[PDB]
Amino acid sequence: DYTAGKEYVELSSPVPVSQPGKIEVVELFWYGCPHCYAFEPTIVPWSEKLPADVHFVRLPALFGGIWNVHGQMFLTLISMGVEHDVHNAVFEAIHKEHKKLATPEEMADFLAGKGVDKEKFLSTYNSFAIKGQMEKAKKLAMAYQVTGVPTMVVNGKYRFDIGSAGGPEETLKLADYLIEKERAAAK
């Protein structure tokens, strides 16, 4: 029922996916983005129920300043294997508890309260590997031609957001539709 050019657009230059062989679903986000926070109760449970051939990932939008700092925190937590465990807490700290989480010392101190090893967080945050991950995330957002958040990209090919889909539920229904489109495709 959806129409290319209306609720979603097809990227004329499709982008490689992070896990070849799975249908990718990317949510570009920023931890400090209030619409992103408000979307969480919709996208979180949906993301946890996806089938075995779908790979859902969040990608931080590194659009400068505090977005880069918060994005670097995200990527650090992913590298440490703990983002999923502290994800809701980071959103709640920023939006309900008034925590800025604006420097790695502040981040580490907060995250220690949630069980995260502070010395490993700081070493990882400042690591050369994370410099590479930051660059890759930047380049992906450029390739998706994304200019704000939250924005969804399915299989490196289809871009849409809450406004274009027509609401938060509609965004997930559209994602589901596009996932089926890609599952049906020749390979």
From Swiss-Prot:
MF GO annotations = protein disulfide isomerase activity; protein-disulfide reductase activity
Q: Could you tell me which cysteines form disulfide bridges? A: 33-36
Q: Which GO terms describe its biological process?
A: cellular response to antibiotic
Q: Which SUPFAM superfamilies match?
A: Thioredoxin-like
Indicate where this protein resides in the cell.
Periplasm
Give the CC-aspect GO terms: outer membrane-bounded periplasmic space
Matches recorded under InterPro entries: DSBA-like_thioredoxin_dom (IPR001853), DsbA/DsbL (IPR023205), Thiol_disulfide_DsbA (IPR050824), Thioredoxin-like_sf (IPR036249), Thioredoxin_CS (IPR017937), Thioredoxin_domain (IPR013766)
Segments forming domain Thioredoxin: 1-180
Matches recorded under Pfam families: DSBA
Which keywords, in A-to-Z order, does the entry hold?
Disulfide bond, Periplasm, Redox-active center, Signal
Q: What does this protein do?
A: Involved in disulfide-bond formation. Acts by transferring its disulfide bond to other proteins.
The similarity annotation says: Belongs to the thioredoxin family. DsbA subfamily.
Q: What is this protein called?
A: Thiol:disulfide interchange protein DsbA
